[PDB]
Structure 1
């Protein structure tokens, strides 16, 4: 029974942590994607302002 416990832990644990630690990547993607679009859109808008 504590065997089947360890397989269940490993399976659900592995799947969930894979999803969350990938969401870490989409998160840092959001971080520096916001940072880049900040100045990018900034220069389009300040070029269309004049």
Structure 2
């Protein structure tokens, strides 16, 4: 009586398709840009290490 979907054994299987998948190929704009803007971490570290040009500035003249 209960009834329902059964998935005997184990192999690659699909069911309840479309919706999520379709929505993914459409945009996912929020997380897409979110992760994309978090990519700057590369440029961030580059700056963090480019700071080393400060070498010239060690000639402090605190008179």
Q: Give the TM-score normalised by structure 1.
A: 0.31
Q: CA deviation at 1:44?
A: 0.8
Q: Give, in whole Å, the separation in 2 of the partners of 1:46 and 1:27.
A: 28
Which protein has the bigger helix share? 1
Alpha-carbon RMSD across the aligned residues, in angstroms, is: 10.0
Runs of at least 5 residues in structure 2 that lack an aligned partner in the other structure: 42-59
Unaligned runs of 5+ in 1: 1-6
CA 1:13–1:42 in structure 2 vs 1: closer, same or farther (change >3 Å)?
Answer: closer
When the two structures are aligned, how many residues end up with a matched partner?
Answer: 44
